[PDB]
Symmetry: C5
Subunit: 376 residues, 5 copies
C-alpha cells in the first residue's frame, strides 16, 4: 500500500504534478521495462528503414506504414480498458473490504466474557486467538506474503496462533478442503461452553457473539471466494489482445517516413515518436492498474499489507480482551457537566472555521409573504 | 472455473502476455471456430474477386467494397458491448454470491444444538443434511452439471442427501412448483422440535438458527430467480445483431482491392487482413465473455464448479457438526500470555516487510507552529 | 418472462445466433412495425426523388441529402442510449427483487406458530393468507395483468384471499390511500394475539415473526414506490428525441443519389439501405429494451409473470404452514453416519469432473527455499 | 412527480412517441425559454451577416464560422453529461429511498404497545405522532414546499404534529443545530416508559421498537445529509461550462454561409438550423434532467410530493395504531381449507396466462442417456 | 462544504448559469493559476513564433504545429477522466457516509440507561463521551483540520473529550498502532458494568447498545481504511499523464500559424485560443473535481466540515442523554383524537398542491369490459 492521502489533502496548484514525481508504486516503476521494449522495437524498425532497406523496399515499407496507421483505432481500446479497469478496481476495493477484522469480536468479548481470573483471561484470549487463527489460515491461503511468512502449519504453531494440541486436532480432522473455518467452529464451541459455565451471563450475549463470529467467518470465506473465482480469463485476454493490437498498429504506422516522398501527414521526421510514447504510457499504465490490482494479495507496492494487518489485529485484540477488560477509569463528571451547551475550544489555526454559519437546512432563507403563510 | 490468481499475484514485465499463452477457458478455445468461419467467408470473397469475376463485375465489387467500408463503425458496437458485458459480468458475480453455503448454519448448529449422544448427533446431522438437500435440489434445478449428476430424485436419495421416508413425504406433497424449499421447512420444524426437547437451550439460539436458515433459503431462492429471469432476450439479440452487422460490414469492406485501380486507401494487397482479424478477435471475444458468463451453471471452463461445491459443503458441514462438536483442546495459556505486546516472528523472505513505518494516519506529519496550537 | 438460460448454458459455436431465431420476446416482434414505417418513409422519399422530382428539384434534393448526412452522428445517441438503458435495466432488476415472497414468513410461521389442532391451523393459515393478501393488493395496484385478474375487491374476496368480514372491516376503514398495508397490520395484531394465547411460545419468536413481516411489507411498499416514481419523463423524452433526430437525419441523408452526378461517396445505387436498416434495427431495439423493461408489470413477453407468482406463493405457503407442520420423518441415521468423510457418487456423465485438483488457495505452489522459511 | 407508468406498461408501436406529446414535467416545459434564447441569438447573428455586414466583414465572418465549426466537438460533452447525469439520477433515487416512512413503526407499535383503553391509545398515537413530527421537521428543513406549508414551529404546532407543552420543551432545549432528532429521543423515552409500565410486554418488543425507531431516524438524518452535502459545485460548473462552450461553438459555426462563395460543406442555405436546434434540445434537455433532479425537494413537476407523503403517512399511521388495534375479524376457515392445493380463479382477460408451462428450472429438458445416468 | 441546494431547488431558466457566478468552491478558484500558466506558455510560444524565429525556423515551427495538432485526441482523456472521476466521486460519498454519528447510540442510551440521579447521568454522559472520543481520535488521525484543532492528546484532554485518568490509562496502553478503538472498548466495559448494576434493565437492551456501538466503531474503522488505502497511485498518475499529454499537444498544435502560408484549417489568426482555453477549463476542472474530492478531509471549500460535525455531535448527544432523559411532556390527546381521518391544514402558498389526484396505483384506469371480468 502506497499512501499519498496527505499529499492530496487539498487541491493545490501543484496538485497531481507532485504525485508525478513519486517512484514507489508508480507507473514508471510498473512500466519502464515495457516502454523500453516498445522503444527498442520502434527504433529497430526505424533503423532498418533508414539504413538497411533498398529503395523499392522503402517504398513498400512506406505503403505498409500508411496502411497500418489506419488501424491505430484507440476508441475501442479506451472503451474496453475503461470498463475492465473499473471492474477490476471495484473488485479490488471489495476484496479489501472482505478482510476479516477482530474489532467487533473483541468489543463483544470484552463486554460479554467475564472473569478477572485466569480462567476468564483464558476464555477471552482463546476466543480472540481463534479469530486471529482463522484470519491467518485464510491469509496464508490467499496471500503470497503471508504464505512466505507461514509456509507451514508448523510455522503457524510456532508463531503462537495455534497450540500443539490444537494442531493435533487440526491435523486429525479428515478433510481434503481448506480448514480455515475450523477455528471458527472452535470459537462457537468455546462460546457455548462459556455460556454453559456462566462466564457469558446471557443468551443474548451468546447470540451477539455468534453473530459477530459469523460475520468474521463470512469475511474469511469471501476472501477465499475472491481468491478462487478470478476475473474471467477470456475478458483479461480480450483486453490484453486489444491493447497489443493497438500497440502493433502504432509500432508499424507511427514510423517516420521520408519527407522527400511527400506523403500526406508525413513531412516532419522527429526520429523520436514523443506522442506515440505518451500514448503507450497512457494505455499501458491504464492496463497496469488492473495488472497490479487484479491480485491485491501479492507483493506489489500497492498491494495490501497483510502481514502488518495480522500483527496489528492480533496485538490490538489481545490488548482489548486481556489488558483492558474491566479496567475503566472511575466514573467522574466531565468538563461540560454543569454547562447546558457544549463546545470544545478551537486553536489559532482552526478558529477561522468558526463564524461559518451553522447549517440548519436549505429552506430557511425563503422569507415568504405574510399572506401566504396563513393556513386555509 | 479457471484460476490464475497466482500467475497475476504481482504486476511483472511478463504480465498478461503469459496469460495469453493459456488454453483452458481461453479466447482461442471459445473463438477459433468463429474465427475460422470468418476467415473462410473472407477468403471465399477474395478468391471470387481475384479469379472468378469479370472486369465489370470487379469494378462493381470494388464500388460495393468502398461503399460498405463506410459503415464499419466500431464506436457504437464498442458502446453496446461495454454496457451489455458489464451488466452480464456483474450479474455473474451476483449469481456466484447467491450460492448457498452451510458455514454459518454449521457454526450455529455446532454452538446451539447440544448433546454428545446419538440423538444430538442425529439432530445436528439432520439439520445440516436438510440444508445440503435444499442446496442440492436448487442446484440440480439450475445447473446442467448438477442435473447430470442427479438426474432423478432416486439419484438424490441414493446419494444420501435424502432418506426413503423423506422421499415418501416429498413425493406425497402436492405441488406443481419446485420443492427446493421443503427441506428448509423441515429444518424449521426440526429446530422447533429440538428447542421443545431442550436440545436447543434458549429461544435466542432458536432465533439465530432460524435467521441463518432464512439466509440460506433466500440464497437458494435467489439462485432460482436468476435461473428463471434471464438477461432480456431483446438486449441479447440487439448486441448480437450489432456485432454481426459490424462483422458483415468488415467482411465486405475490408477486401483488398486491386492496387492498379488506384483507389484511395487501397494501394496495398496483403491478401490477409491481419488487423481485421485482430478486430474480429477483440469484438467476438468481448461478446464471448458474456456468452460464457450469461449462464455460469453450464459446463464451460469458467463456469462454477457446483459439484465440487456440493461435495465440499456437505463434507465440511458434517465434520463441523459431528466430529468437532464439543471437541475442543483444553484451555491453555498462549505463547504471548506473559507478553504485554504481541507479534509473530517473520521469515527471511518476509522480514523486509518490517522496518516499513506503521501507518498511524495521514495527518501526523503536519508539524504546526507553536503559536497555532494554542486554544482560543 | 422469456427464459433461454438452458440455450445459453454453454458458450457454443452457435452461441447467440440461435437466439437470433427466437420470436417471443424478440426484437423482431417488438420492432417490425417501426421498421416497416421507417422503410416506407425511406421508400416514399426515394420514389419521389426517382420519379416525381424535376431536374432542379433533384439537384436541390441531392444538396439537402448531402447536408443532412453530416448530422447522422452515432456517438451521442450511443452514449445516451447506453446510460439510459443501463439505468432502466438496473431499475428493472431492482423491481424484480422487490417482489414480496412468503418463503421466509412461511418458514418462521411453521417453526414458531404451534398447535396441530384447528386453532393452530387457523392461526398459521390466516397469517400466511394475510401476507398473500397484501401481496395481491399491491400487485393489483401495480400490475395490469393482476388488475385484470382482480378488477374488484369482490374479485379478491371470491378468490379466497380475503373473507367477507375482513372485507367489511377493510371497506369500513376510512382512508383515501391504498390499503395494501392493512393485512400487514392484521398480521401484526394476530401475531400478538397468538403470542398472548401461548401459540407462539417465546418473545424472540414473536420478534422474528414481526421482523419478517416488516421485510415483506417493505417489499410491498417498494413495489408501490417503483410504480409511483417513474423514470424521469424529461430523461425518457430526451432519449426518444435524440433517437428520432438521428433517424430523421438518416432518413434524409441515407438516400441513394444518382451516381451520374458524381457526388463524393455517392457512386453506388443499391435502392435498399441495408446498413441503414441494420443501424435502425440496432438503435431502435436498444431503445425497445428500455421500452419493454420500463414497466415490468405490463403484459409484454418479457414482463414478470405476476399471476404465476401469486399462485405459486399462495399454494406453497399454504402447503408449508398447514400440510408440512410438525410432519417430519423420524430421525434416522444418514448414509454417511459411520463414514468419517463424505462424498456423494458421480454419474458417468459427470465423473470427468473428478480428478480436477481440489482448490486449496493460490499460494500453495510457491515452493520457497529452505533458507527463506526460517523465522528471524 | 409525473407518473406515466400506465402509459408504458407495454412496449407498443406508439411507444415513447405518445410520451413526446406530454407537457407536465416535460422537456418542452423545462427548455422552451432556453431554446428561444438560443434561436434568438442565432437569428440575430444570421440577420447581421445577411443584411448588416459589408463584403469584407462577411468574408471575415465566414472565416470565423469555418474556424469555430471545428470546435463543435459533441463527444466530450456527451461523456461528461452521461457521467454527471448518471450520478445525479442515482443520487436522486437514493434521496427518494431516504424518505422516512412510518409503516414498519406502525406495524411494530400495533403489535407491541397494548391496551384498548385511553392510555394505550395515547401511547400508540403519541409514538406515531413523534415519528411523524420528526419527519415533518426534517422535511420542512429540506423541502421548499414543506417549508412553505410549515414556515414556523407555530404552524407545526397548530397543524397538530406538536403540542404546546412539547413546543415549550422543544424551544427550551438549548441547541444551535437542527432539532429533528428531538421527537426521536422522545419516542425512545416514551417506549422505555411504556415497557416500564407493562404496556410493552417484553424486552424483545422494546428492542424491536427501538430498532425501527433508529431506522426511521437514520432515514431522517440521511435526508439532512443529502440536503447539506450538495453535488460538487466544481463538477456542476464543469458540466455547465462544457455544454455552454459547445453551444457557443454551434452558435458561431452552424451559421449558414453564402453558397455563392463555394465553401466546402456550405452550399445549402436553409435559414433555419433544424439539426442544430435538435442537438441543442438533446443536450440542453440532458442537462435539464440533472437540473430538475439535483434537488428533488423543490417544486418541479417531477419533484417528490412531500406534502402528500406527510398527509398519507400521518393518516395511515394513525389508522393503523388506533382504529385497527386489536380489531381483527374472527378467525374463520378460508376458502381452500379442505383443498389440498390452492389456486385462485382467472378472469376471461387473464385465463390465457394459464397453459403457460410452470417453470421448474432450466435443466429439466436435458434428457440424458440411460448409460450416462448410472452412478460410478 | 459549499451548499447550493436552495439555488437549485427548481429547474429555472437561469439554472446553472447563476451557479457559474459562484466563487467559493468554484472551478475558477481551483483552476485560475493553472489557466494562467497554460496561457503564459501559449503566449510565450506565440510571441517567439511571431517575433523571434527566422523564416526557416517559422516554417519548421509550422510543420511541428501541424504534426502536433494530429495528436490532440480528446476521446481518450474523456474516457479516462470520466471513469476515474466517477470512481473518486463514489468513494467521496462513501467516505462521507462512513462518518461516525452518535444519534443511534444516543437514542439507545436515553432509552436504556436509566436513573435520574448523578450516577445515571454519569453513565449516560460517559458512554456518549466515549463514542465522541473515538470519533475525535479517528478524525484527528484522518483530517488535517481536526488535527490542527487537536494536535496533541493534551489538546484532546483539555477539550473535555478525555479525562486525566482516562489519559493515563490510554498512554499506559502498550500499542504501536492507532488507539481510536480504545474508547469503544471502554464503552463496552461500561455498558457491561451498567447492566450488572441494573442501570440497564435487560440483556436485550445491552445487546442493542453493543450492536450500535459496533456500528459506530465500524464507521470509525472505515474512515481509517479510507485514509490508509488511497486511490491507486498508478491510476492517478495515468490520468494526470494523459491530461498533460493532451495539454502539451494542444499547447503546440493550437498555435495560430501565419494565414499567408495558406495551410489547411489555418487561415484565421485570432491571437487568442478561446476554444482551446475553454477545453483546458473543461478538462482541467474535470480533473480538479477528483483533485478536491480525493481527500475530503483536507481544507478545501468542498471538504467536509469535520470540526462542525464534532461540535454538533457532542452537543446533541449530551443534550439527548442528559437534558432530555425522562423529560417527556405529559401524555395528552392530540388534535385528531376524535377525528376518524387526519390531515394537517395547508397554507395559501401550498393549497394548490391539493386537488392533485391521490395516487392509488397505475392500474386503476384500465376500465375493462364486463365480459372480461368474470372468473373462469
Ligand atoms: Ca480535499
Ligand atoms: Ca498485485
Ligand atoms: Ca456458461
Ligand atoms: Ca413492459
Ligand atoms: Ca427540483
Ligand atoms: Cl435479537
Amino acid at each position: 500500500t502506497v499512501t499519498y492521502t496527505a499529499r492530496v489533502a487539498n487541491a493545490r496548484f501543484g496538485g497531481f504534478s507532485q504525485l508525478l514525481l513519486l517512484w514507489r508504486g508508480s507507473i514508471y516503476k510498473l512500466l519502464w521495462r515495457e516502454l523500453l521494449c516498445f522503444l527498442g522495437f520502434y527504433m529497430a524498425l526505424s533503423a532498418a528503414y533508414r539504413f538497411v532497406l533498398t529503395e523499392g523496399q522503402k517504398r513498400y515499407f512506406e505503403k505498409l506504414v500508411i496502411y497500418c496507421d489506419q488501424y491505430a483505432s484507440l476508441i475501442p481500446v479506451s472503451f474496453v480498458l475503461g470498463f475492465y479497469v473499473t471492474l477490476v478496481v471495484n473488485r479490488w476495493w471489495s476484496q479489501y473490504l472482505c478482510m476479516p477484522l477482530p474489532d467487533a469480536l473483541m468489543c463483544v468479548v470484552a463486554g460479554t466474557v467475564h472473569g478477572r481470573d485466569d480462567r476468564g483471561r483464558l476464555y477471552r484470549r482463546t476466543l480472540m486467538r481463534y479469530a486471529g487463527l482463522s484470519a491467518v489460515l485464510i491469509l496464508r491461503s490467499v496471500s503470497t506474503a503471508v504464505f512466505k511468512r507461514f509456509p507451514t502449519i508448523d510455522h503457524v504453531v510456532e508463531a503462537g496462533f495455534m497450540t500443539r494440541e490444537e494442531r493435533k486436532k487440526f491435523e486429525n480432522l479428515n478433510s481434503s478442503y481448506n480448514k480455515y473455518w475450523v477455528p471458527c467452529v472452535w470459537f462457537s464451541n468455546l462460546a457455548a461452553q462459556a455460556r454453559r459455565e456462566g462466564r457469558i451471563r446471557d443468551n443474548s450475549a451468546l447470540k451477539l457473539l455468534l453473530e459477530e463470529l459469523n460475520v468474521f467467518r463470512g469475511k474469511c470465506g469471501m476472501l477465499f471466494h475472491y481468491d478462487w473465482i478470478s476475473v474471467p480469463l477470456v475478458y483479461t485476454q480480450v483486453v490484453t489482445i486489444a491493447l497489443y493490437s493497438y500497440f502493433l498498429a502504432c509500432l508499424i504506422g507511427r514510423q517516420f517516413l521520408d519527407p522527400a516522398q511527400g506523403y500526406k501527414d508525413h513531412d516532419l521526421d522527429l526520429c523520436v515518436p514523443i506522442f506515440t510514447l505518451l500514448q503507450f504510457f497512457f494505455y499501458a499504465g491504464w492496463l497496469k492498474v488492473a495488472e497490479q490490482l487484479i491480485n491485491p494479495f501479492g507483493e506489489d507496492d500497492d498491494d495490501f499489507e497483510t502481514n502488518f494487518l495480522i500483527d496489528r489485529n492480533f496485538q490490538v485484540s489481545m490488548l482489548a480482551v486481556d489488558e483492558m477488560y474491566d479496567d475503566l477509569a472511575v466514573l467522574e463528571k466531565d468538563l461540560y457537566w454543569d454547562a447546558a451547551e457544549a463546545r470544545a475550544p478551537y486553536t489559532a489555526a482552526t478558529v477561522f472555521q468558526l463564524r461559518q454559519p451553522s447549517f440548519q437546512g436549505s429552506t430557511f432563507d425563503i422569507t415568504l409573504a405574510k399572506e401566504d403563510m396563513q393556513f386555509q
